[PDB]
Ligand SMILES: CO[C@H]([C@H](C)/C=C/N(C)CO)[C@@H](C)C(=O)CC[C@H](C)[C@H](C[C@@H]1OC(=O)C[C@@H](OC(N)O)C[C@H](C)C[C@H](O)[C@H](C)[C@@H](OC)c2coc(n2)-c2coc(n2)-c2coc(n2)/C=C/C[C@H](OC)[C@H]1C)OC
Ligand SMILES: CO[C@H]([C@H](C)/C=C/N(C)CO)[C@@H](C)C(=O)CC[C@H](C)[C@H](C[C@@H]1OC(=O)C[C@@H](OC(N)O)C[C@H](C)C[C@H](O)[C@H](C)[C@@H](OC)c2coc(n2)-c2coc(n2)-c2coc(n2)/C=C/C[C@H](OC)[C@H]1C)OC
Ligand SMILES: Nc1ncnc2c1ncn2[C@@H]1O[C@H](COP(=O)(O)OP(=O)(O)OP(=O)(O)O)[C@@H](O)[C@H]1O
Ligand SMILES: Nc1ncnc2c1ncn2[C@@H]1O[C@H](COP(=O)(O)OP(=O)(O)OP(=O)(O)O)[C@@H](O)[C@H]1O
């Protein structure tokens with residue numbers, strides 16, 4: 001009878017819609033603009049007025065850090081993007097792996113006390129992605145605009161002790177591509193120019209199967225070169241930039257980070273898990289998030305994990321075509337399930353206990 | 361107190377000696393002979409017994425590809441050419457640009473585990489050549505018997521993203537000269553006959569300043585003709601063959617290759633480098649390797665880069681007279697430097713970590 005809302009709060013993009021739908025109805029930037037001199041603006045409007053506004057990202061590395069601006073994002077999501085009255089819909093919110101308890105309580109408080117929701121729930125993003133692939137056991141690589149995680153999941157639940165995190169994602173890859181092209185004589189600095197580079201990244205970048213062979217090919221021929229036309233009609237051609245950019249995921253030292261690459265964090269996560277469930281994890285590597293959209297990434301992961309894993313182990317990388325929205329879809333499904341309707345944290349329950357009722 | 365060894369492993373010739381000396385004491389062919397029916401032979405001995413041996417080149421296009429035969433080359437280098445005991449000398453080895461990491465680890469393993477060296481180091485050949493010219497910033501064209509590279513170098517370090525490679529060098533030029541003379545009625549096929557053509561190439565070939573004017577001169581007069589006496593007393597005269605041969609460096613289509621010429625790869629390398637350091641690269645083009653020994657090559661490069669580069673740019677091609685051995689000399693110097701003695705990878709360090717300690 002009543003429709004649940006699903007809201008996936010990302011570092012770069014907010015994905016929102018109605019439980020049961022196959023895609024989010026709303027997808028907009030996680031930005032809040034406030035007049036340097038309406039007291040606030042959200043998303044594309046905030047960016048269109050950037051010349052007179054101070055732009056802020058309320059979610060950093062997947063964690064909400066500015067609560068006033070986050071209320072404005074949720075307000076815009078409910079009233080403008082979805083045109084619902086939040087007091088009439090159970091609302092499923094998503095959170096990043098390793099989100100502090102206090103942070104989850106604050107989300108719970110805002111939903112109940114500011115938006116007056118009748119019931120709500122907070123789910124881990126990576127766990128939702130797994131569900132969206134039809135599995136309750138597996139290991140997810142979730143890479144977005146702000147953070148990357150490996151989350152091993154067993155019988156529906158994440159194993160927090162074996163979660164690995166890499167503070168490097170899409171925004172950093174875009175920054176790196178901006179920096180490379182700029183050194184080459186072009187100038188990509190403004191936010192307008194950042195949107196151009198983001199588009200170049202999404203359209204022309206790919207993950208090399210063998211980075212070293214690819215660099216050799218690029219050095220000895222132009223067979224890997226692609227051309228991109230800028231808005232002013234000017235043309236820019238890239239070669240090894242196409243794959244050096246996402247290679248950073250596997251070699252964080254490319255941007256001065258000492259961290260392990262996504263292939264190593266994947267193997268390390270599995271290796272922190274119970275020896276008796278590793279077989280199932282190796283066989284169920286699910287990729288999720290926009291930064292896993294690079295052509296070649298699955299084959300490259302397959303190759304890297306195979307080299308680290310014992311020789312007899314069956315390795316399988318699942319990379320669904322709708323993985324830009326896997327998290328949201330996982331939430332739409334869960335929130336639709338008959339079994340799940342007893343899991344909602346009700347307003348009455350919140351009024352009874354405190355925000356600490358939310359800890360699952 | 362202890363003398364370091366320098367060993368420069370080329371596709372055609374091995375150059376080896378002692379750090380501090382002004383030239384390699386040993387220079388011999390990179391060949392290993394194994395009896396079709398001593399289990400092995402190296403260099404000039406292998407070639408003298410070619411009629412009953414299978415000859416193999418363990419380094420192809422500057423990259424080591426046969427490790428068993430390479431051990432034999434190093435063994436011969438240490439024990440026979442230099443008459444040293446490798447366990448008493450730090451040893452500096454050279455590698456080609458874009459050498460795979462795994463390849464460098466295998467060299468490291470052999471040096472420590474098979475020859476028991478006390479300490480060693482692997483340096484990029486082109487970078488050494490630059491050092492031998494008294495510079496830590498510049499762009500080197502390195503052309504030998506098996507491969508050609510452009511390596512831009514800034515404050516002592518190669519910029520791997522802007523390295524260009526041309527899979528064409530001296531061996532291919534010799535092959536081309538063999539093929540041309542053979543079509544002309546002569547027969548140059550055997551390895552003995554290849555040595556004759558190599559000698560003709562080295563003695564009589566040159567790079568034309570203007571290829572098209574030179575072809576016209578050759579067509580309308582005999583003023584460019586030179587005569588060469590074969591071992592049997594027979595005389596062969598060449599005209600446009602003298603400069604058509606090395607022209608291949610600038611026009612790879614002469615041997616059916618779609619690749620860019622050495623002038624284009626030079627400009628392209630500079631253009632992949634930071635715009636703010638190009639001025640310094642244009643002003644510091646160093647030539648290195650035997651295939652850069654052709655009379656006329658510097659003036660021709662000067663002319664070609666000038667035509668591609670912006671009109672106000674100062675272009676300078678440095679072609680040292682000892683450039684057959686620039687790489688080795690650069691290594692002799694580095695390995696002698698007081699500053700460099702802390703850079704050696706020690707046996708203890710190798711025993712501590714793995715072969716991966718070698719990545720500079
Ligand atoms: C009750 O929740 C518990 C536990 C209490 C919670 C724990 N946490 C929250 C934890 O941390 C939890 C362990 C649990 O059971 C999770 C169950 C998962 C959500 C999930 C459930 C199953 O759910 C699933 O297995 C999901 C898969 O469905 C099937 N049949 O395989 C998804 C497909 C692989 C791909 C999509 O179809 C594809 C992406 C696309 O298809 C066009 C699609 C787009 O939107 C949707 N599908 C969609 C939107 O809503 C729905 N689908 C939907 C709503 O109901 C259904 N689908 C129904 C079918 C029933 C499924 O049976 C196969 C369903 C049982 O299991 C993988
Ligand atoms: C410490 O190494 C770092 C870094 C850690 C390493 C990085 N990589 C390895 C990187 O990828 C690196 C950045 C670095 O500093 C490189 C330094 C270079 C090797 C080089 C060093 C200089 O070294 C140089 O600048 C080299 C030049 O010397 C001078 N004075 O100009 C060479 C001449 C131009 C030509 C030769 O004289 C000529 C070919 C011939 O002369 C008859 C000759 C033949 O053999 C030799 N010379 C010879 C053999 O050993 C030596 N010379 C020798 C040993 O010590 C010296 N020379 C000494 C003089 C000191 C130089 O000062 C001018 C010396 C400081 O700089 C161009
Ligand atoms: N085809 C593509 N190729 C590469 N990257 C892409 C592609 N499409 C989108 N992206 C990148 O994915 C990111 C958005 O993904 P997503 O919406 O999953 O992240 P998010 O949830 O906002 O951030 P996070 O999960 O880090 O908090 C952006 O950085 C975007 O540039
Ligand atoms: N005077 C000369 N003119 C032209 N070519 C020459 C001359 N002297 C030597 N060569 C050529 O240079 C090559 C040897 O140069 P070098 O020793 O620098 O190469 P390498 O290091 O063995 O090979 P690579 O660097 O490709 O692995 C041979 O092909 C030889 O014919």
Ligand SMILES: [Ca+2]
Nearest residue numbers: 010011125144
């Ligand atoms: Ca996300």
Ligand SMILES: [Ca+2]
Nearest residue numbers: 370371485504
């Ligand atoms: Ca060489």
